[PDB]
RNA sequence: UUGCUCCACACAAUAUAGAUGGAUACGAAUAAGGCGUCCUUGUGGCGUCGCUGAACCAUAGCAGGCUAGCAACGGUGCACUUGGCGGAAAGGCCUUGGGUGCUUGCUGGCGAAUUGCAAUGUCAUUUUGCGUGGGGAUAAAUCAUUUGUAUACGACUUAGA
RNA sequence: GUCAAGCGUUCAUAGCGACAUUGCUUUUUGAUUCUUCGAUGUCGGCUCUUCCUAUCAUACCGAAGCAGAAUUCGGUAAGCG
């Protein structure tokens, strides 16, 4: 789950006599593997349509890679989650070079700030925010200023020995 | 949120020299000199053009950003105190017993001593802190004027003189007797 | 009459800052910061060394004193061209930091015969050094 | 790797130093800790003073001379923190605790010996900036230690002597560095530089 | 020379143990300068002496030796497991052992 | 019934929480410092360093023998000694000079074998005893008797050539 | 403890506080029958120690429908009675 992957999953709802060639529903799923992806596919299709895994089939599952994995992108994520007392819709902005990176950051962020588990979260939408000043959140907007530069004060240097002889420094 | 960079301006007037070794600030203007240890904040001072000093916080949370404007106000108070000084004027409020405030020597330690506060036989004593000058006003009755470079010292010594004359065991909406700060300003201002 | 405020000069996370990867696959190679993703993560690019363009935590990274002029979000061909124009590797090799890295790699590479020769030459230099000290 | 290791306890967190020292003692290393009045505990002073008074509260009710013995000196607070990280009721842990000496200040022999740090335990490497901390000399004085002023006087004396030592040591290393620089750019020194030396 | 050492020093740390049961048949050794299981893979199969002193000469020596061998690495930090011909006495917890350079590979 | 102590060296017995090249000395800060240099001597200017001790010192020679020179007047061991500093437990640190060896800084000569293909292959430091030869000093305590400032008995406080 | 209809000469909350509702305690009494029926001496008082704080007094304070006096509400506090 540190590497989520994104999959398109197309499922069908199996052809009967009255309906040959059914409607081919497609989802984008964030999962660790294809097993979890097909599981989540049937989870969301049993919430949208009158279908279930026993009366349907999977016709395709493909891993979608990121088109530009080394371009920095601003993402808006619309998410629905369960709290301890209700269900809430939430919009967050996440800055990464990948959609699965944004979704991993979202899951860590939701577990951190809201104590929301994976079982309580629906990703409603991930969309790359195409233009600056459509960026709503000011924790993202601070990284879009011109000629941005900052230091990292108080550098803590990792020691591999138990004892040090020098009384180290946190210069940087 | 951890704001990336929050930064405050500090304006130095012409006759003032500010020396900031690590976070120990020394401000030297015409009235004298002042020093403040600021090693409890973790800010970063820098000098722009010998009349402007930036102070900045990097990757600082809400409380750490809140302390930065405090640091700017502390160094501005140092500059204002060594340029203009501070002058706090207190009034004696009494109904029947006239509060008798004199300044006295006890072993060279320079005390304000207060007699007849609400008819008390107890002499009260507030030590004048170093830097604070006590004088008594002419053509304004019942006014004691505390002056000095350090607003901390002048304000705390005026607060000592106010808290030493608080009323015990009486309704203090009716027994208003005390010494109160009436004016806060500067020594040399117009 | 002069206001004196200390410098306290840090290395800035900025586009064009040269970084040394400590840990991972690259691990001792030079890259350059291409864009700042957030406070704890930047996009690096080390095409001379062989570092792929990647997102990385700054904790996998030590910044160097060396910068060069790079535009934000510059692609790998741009990074390579501007890195060669600024001649980053020749600034880096002349620093005392990279000489110490080369020194400890060289002392790691020494064989037993070379360690014996290091002992013999150190005693030979030591004799002259003690003569110079006792006449100065 | 030394026969005994002398830790200068200044700027160290008490638990993070005590677990490291407990593991060195049990693994067979003799440890002497100096400047235990300059140790740190994280969290504010009133916080840690209430913790000590909560500890001070508990004693054997029928005989206070057999109670938990509330030791007041900063070296003894460090010793108490390091017990409990050692099975001290066994012979092995008794022998481990016999490998440890903790002192306030730096007394003789150790004042002319190298002092080390434990960077796993350093307050400036472990605590987030802005986090409050307690100095163990101040805490010990608040809970009844008598000798804060004597240790400060002797440490000022020791530091005057140590600075007069270090002035002579810099005056010698000036000459040694210059004489090593005279031997540089010779056929032996370039031969040594070819081998990383 | 001033030194004649052809072994690496180590510390007998512990038996193999769970939280409450020990196994004296295996002993845990720290080797000086070894902080990594792959750095400690060099020492596998090396020949260990615990060298100790007794009052009674038995074959013209007051020095007695227990011989054993590094079997596998233990954990993440360069501790190894060792087995000896007779198990280590358990008062030697923290005592110094010798890891010889033979059987040699490199 | 030649007792006690100290010093040195001969041999024994007890052991050893565990020698195996060296515990290698600023202080302070860590949103700062170290070092070098310069001046106006400061909370100064300039340069440089860190990114770990992965260092530095030391380290060649029968467990390190015997011997011959060259260069230098350095390094180092042991005792003798001069002067000083050190009381936190100093019991150490820095010196002055003369001996006394050694030196791998450089170049030579001789020896090592059979411990038979590994078997720590014994080289450390506390207690003691006893032997020998070189100094030094020449007491108390307790019972018993006694006191009553003490006291169940012990103990305590007094006295007695 | 919360809520505040209402009382408090006007005024919900100085002090109170209905209709509701959330708790804590184990110094009451029930509920239970787990331990003891080859026996754990069963009421109260006397004596004596310690502990708790939900503080009556004493210390220092905040509030009042506290002018003074005398009270009332509340805080730290079990040091001492
Ligand atoms: Mg599922
Ligand atoms: Mg939150
Ligand atoms: Mg720093
Ligand atoms: Mg009052
Ligand atoms: Mg009254
Ligand atoms: Mg040398
Ligand atoms: Mg040991
Ligand atoms: Mg324990
Ligand atoms: Mg030291
Ligand atoms: Mg005290
Ligand atoms: Mg006491
Ligand atoms: Mg085990
Ligand atoms: Mg381990
Ligand atoms: Mg064993
Ligand atoms: Mg044991
Ligand atoms: Mg500098
Ligand atoms: Mg300087
Ligand atoms: Mg003494
Ligand atoms: Mg030699
Ligand atoms: Mg009597
Ligand atoms: Mg009697
Ligand atoms: Mg409640
Ligand atoms: Mg009202
Ligand atoms: Mg029975
Ligand atoms: Mg009974
Ligand atoms: Mg209470
Ligand atoms: Mg009360
Ligand atoms: Mg009283
Ligand atoms: Mg009581
Ligand atoms: Mg009481």
Question: How does the SSE layout of this entry go?
Answer:
The structure is cut from a larger assembly and holds chains A (172 residues), B (190 residues), C (136 residues), D (197 residues) and E (106 residues).
Chain A: E1 5-11, E2 25-31, H1 34-48, E3 58-64, E4 73-82, E5 87-96, H2 99-114, E6 121-128, H3 138-141, E7 150-151
Antiparallel strand pairs in A: 1-2, 1-3, 4-5, 4-6
Chain C: E1 4-5, E2 12-13, E3 17-21, E4 30-38, E5 41-46, E6 51-57, E7 61-67, H1 76-86, H2 88-93, H3 96-108, H4 112-135
Chain E: E1 7-17, E2 22-31, H1 37-40, E3 47-53, E4 63-74, E5 79-84, E6 96-100
Bound molecules: magnesium ion (30 copies).
Chain D binds two RNA strands through strand 1, helix 4 and helix 7.
PDB class: ribosome
Keywords: yeast, 80S complex
Entry title: Stm1 bound vacant 80S structure isolated from wild-type
Properties at a glance:
part of a larger assembly; 5 chains; A: 172 residues; Ubiquitin-like (UB roll); 2 domains; three-stranded antiparallel sheet; 3 helices; elongated; D: mainly alpha; three-stranded parallel sheet; two-stranded antiparallel ribbon; 8 helices; 49% helix; binds magnesium ion; RNA-binding
Polypeptide structure, described:
Chain C: This is Large ribosomal subunit protein eL14A. Chain C: It is found in: Cytoplasm. Chain C: Belongs to the eukaryotic ribosomal protein eL14 family. Chain C: Pfam families: KOW, Ribosomal_L14e. The structure is cut from a larger assembly and holds chains A (172 residues), B (190 residues), C (136 residues), D (197 residues) and E (106 residues). With 172 residues, chain A is of the alpha+beta class. Chain A has 3 helices and 7 strands. Chain A has 2 domains: 3-69, Ubiquitin-like (UB roll), CATH 3.10.20.10; 70-146, Roll (Ubiquitin-like (UB roll)). Helices cover 20% and strands 30% of the residues of chain A. Chain A has a 3-stranded antiparallel sheet, sandwiched between helices. In chain A, strands 5-4-6 form a 3-stranded antiparallel sheet, with helices on one face. Chain C has helices at residues 76-86, 88-93, 96-108, 112-135, and strands spanning 4-5, 12-13, 17-21, 30-38, 41-46, 51-57, 61-67. Helices cover 40% and strands 28% of the residues of chain C. Chain E has 1 helix and 6 strands. The two termini of chain E are 24 Å apart. Chains in contact: A-B, A-C, A-D, B-C, C-D, D-E. The structure holds magnesium ion (30 copies). One magnesium ion (MG) binds at residues 114-115 of chain D. Chain D binds 2 RNA strands through β1, α4 and α7.
What CATH first level of the largest domain in chain A would be assigned? Alpha Beta
User: What fraction strand of chain B?
Assistant: 35-45%
**Sheet bearing the most strands of chain B, described?**
4 strands, antiparallel
Shape of chain A: elongated
**Number of helical elements of chain A:** 3
Bound molecule kinds, no repeats: magnesium ion
Q: What percentage of residues of chain A falls in helices of 4 or more residues?
A: 10-25%
Protein name (chain B): Large ribosomal subunit protein uL6A
Pfam families (chain B): Ribosomal_L6
Organism (chain B): Saccharomyces cerevisiae (strain ATCC 204508 / S288c) (Baker's yeast)
GO cellular component, one term (chain B): cytosolic large ribosomal subunit
